[PDB]
Design a protein around this ligand. Structure first.
Ligand SMILES: Nc1nc(=O)c2ncn([C@@H]3O[C@H](COP(=O)(O)OP(=O)(O)OP(=O)(O)OP(=O)(O)O)[C@@H](O)[C@H]3O)c2[nH]1
Length: 300
């Protein structure tokens, strides 16, 4: 197999600007078995990694563009695993992961974007965000009371948190992603879409295996109970912050190998639009390289 069948499926995963979203209805969380096999995918996935390494190697040397890659997802979605697998084939000098956590005091003394702007990737580098500024329209939207404890949010009472407030954030975010898009950054955003069913399965597997037992937090359940509120926030974000510049992609997360294949595939596709090449050796340089070979060969 090859990428022929998949390539049309991928197009559906892109979120078109301002198209309405029904996550339960429209977007699946498991792969259709009629498309590919787990074995076929593992082979293509492997091509994806090697091809992504070539791109990264050319991106580093070209030093013209940076790449920002966002991963947003519910707990047990497979973010960390996805990040890890994608970075296994890359060179660690041109790639940084930043796994954003609950803000620090210093971070809350700044606008909510500041800690993200600070962590942006440089020319020739790939930055990966395991969670992002989009947390400020997700967990914060499910729990508006947090806003009261962010001095910079400008939210003094809970009643001033309305759809106009989130529209204003979408705009802020969109302006942010537009400015960096206009200044060298290729932004790609992935929503790893895991279903309640598979989340419950993974949560239990985590709770039964001693290797993962110690790690499991019970607060993850508090957020599962707000599934519907999270679905509302995701759907609204997706509709208002996916652009042709900074597109969102909804990726099914119930089958991990398949999640990893799609993401690898989409990153390659989007970065191939840059037409990256290794630098060419001029005649002058080729002559210098050949003088050096001669010197080495003519050693006592
Ligand atoms: N209030 C607040 N404001 C913010 O700006 C912000 N940014 C991030 N976060 C919170 O940091 C927590 C990150 O901790 P975590 O439980 O270690 O998340 P993961 O390990 O990636 O899930 P996992 O189960 O390991 O997922 P995978 O298996 O897919 O890796 C999450 O609850 C986020 O809501 C924020 N909270």
């Amino acid at each position: 197999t090859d990428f022929s069948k998949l390539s049309k499926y991928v197009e559906t995963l892109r979120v078109k600007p301002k198209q309405s979203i029904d996550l339960k209805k429209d977007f699946d969380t498991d792969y259709d078995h009629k498309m590919l096999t787990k074995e076929e995918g593992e082979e293509l996935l492997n091509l994806g990694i090697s091809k992504l390494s070539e791109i990264q190697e050319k991106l580093y040397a070209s030093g013209t563009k940076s790449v920002l890659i966002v991963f947003q997802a519910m707990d047990a979605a497979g973010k960390d695993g996805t990040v890890k697998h994608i970075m296994t084939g890359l060179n660690p000098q041109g790639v940084k992961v930043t796994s954003f956590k609950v803000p620090s005091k210093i971070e809350l003394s700044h606008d909510y974007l500041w800690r993200h702007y600070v962590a942006l990737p440089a020319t020739g580098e790939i930055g990966i965000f395991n969670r992002s500024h989009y947390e400020n329209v997700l967990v914060t939207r499910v729990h508006p009371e947090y806003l009261l404890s962010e001095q910079t949010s400008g939210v003094t009472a809970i009643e001033q948190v309305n759809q106009k407030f989130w529209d204003k954030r979408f705009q802020q975010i969109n302006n942010f992603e537009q400015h960096i898009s206009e200044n060298g950054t290729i932004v790609l955003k992935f929503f790893l879409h895991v279903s309640k069913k598979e989340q419950k399965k993974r949560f239990i597997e985590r709770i039964e295996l001693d290797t993962k037992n110690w790690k499991f937090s019970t607060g993850d359940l508090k957020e599962r109970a707000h599934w519907k509120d999270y679905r509302n926030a995701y759907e609204d974000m997706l509709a208002n912050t996916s652009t042709k510049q900074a597109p969102w992609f909804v990726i099914p997360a119930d089958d991990k190998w398949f999640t990893r294949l799609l993401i690898a595939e989409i990153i390659c596709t989007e970065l191939e639009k840059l037409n990256l090449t290794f630098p060419t050796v001029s005649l002058e340089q080729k002559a210098e390289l050949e003088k050096a070979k001669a010197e080495l060969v003519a050693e006592k």
